[PDB]
């Protein structure tokens, strides 16, 4: 159920393939939607989740470098997929930028994203 | 125990008083140490902690406005006090800055501070 095209509340697109061995691979596309807004993602997920009605834990990372630009940063999303009627992936994320030693205090941003298979507006 | 003068790894000073009512009141003094870098803090703590060796949970907030300046943000520290020889307060913090809705997604920084009674 994980495999497919997902959208967060801001309109970014998360294209993912969930492998039999627990790998996640795919592409993250920022809201703008152009070639320059595409980035590689990789992660892992629980390929044998519990059958007690719990979600499937997963995580992934995007380094914000592609052939057109480099933001010297990476974001990791940690969350769970919840299947059923309106499937969704609920996450919290950490965005860390490379910084000097003196500026390490503004290195990491924290936030939350909810992904659905329906794109919002 | 909690009441006292504490220092973080970076040179800031946290003067706090823990009241019988679970209140934390005090002053945060930034690394510079001048009048313009003093800010009010308020928070709460578990005034009746477990006696099994567990720490004492607490938290406090500083809004970064004083009579001299305003950084349009506030920081909250969440953590626990661990007493004994080498008393420490271990925390994680969230610093949120006032932003427009478009920039909200980047409004909160996260980090961690350990406080000791020795500078």
């Amino acid at each position: 159920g994980i495999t497919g095209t997902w959208y967060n509340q801001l309109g970014s697109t998360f294209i993912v393939t969930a492998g039999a061995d627990g790998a996640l691979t795919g592409t993250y596309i920022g809201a703008r939607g152009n070639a320059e807004s595409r980035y590689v993602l990789t992660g892992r997920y629980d390929s044998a989740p519990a059958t007690d009605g719990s979600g499937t834990a997963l995580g992934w990372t995007v380094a914000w470098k592609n052939n057109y630009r480099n933001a010297h940063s990476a974001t990791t999303w940690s969350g769970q997929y919840v299947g059923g009627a309106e499937a969704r992936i609920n996450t919290q994320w950490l965005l860390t930028s490379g910084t000097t030693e003196a500026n390490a205090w503004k290195s990491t941003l924290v936030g939350h994203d909810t992904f659905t298979k329906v794109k919002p507006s | 125990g909690i009441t006292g003068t504490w220092y973080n790894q970076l040179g800031s000073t946290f003067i706090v008083t823990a009241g019988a009512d679970g209140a934390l009141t005090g002053t945060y003094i930034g690394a510079r140490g001048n009048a313009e870098s003093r800010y009010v803090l308020t928070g709460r703590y578990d005034s009746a902690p477990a006696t099994d060796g567990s720490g004492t949970a607490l938290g406090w907030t500083v809004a970064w406005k004083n009579n001299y300046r305003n950084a349009h943000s506030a920081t909250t520290w969440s953590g626990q006090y661990v007493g004994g020889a080498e008393a420490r307060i271990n925390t994680q913090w969230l610093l949120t800055s006032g932003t427009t809705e478009a920039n909200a997604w980047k409004s909160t920084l996260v980090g961690h501070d350990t406080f000791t009674k020795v500078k």
């Binding site: 205090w105 | 930034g30 690394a31 870098s37 800010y39 500083v62 970064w64 920081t75």
Partner: peptide, 6 residues
């Protein structure tokens, strides 16, 4: 920012 001023 004040929290980290040298």
């Amino acid at each position: 920012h004040p929290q980290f001023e040298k």
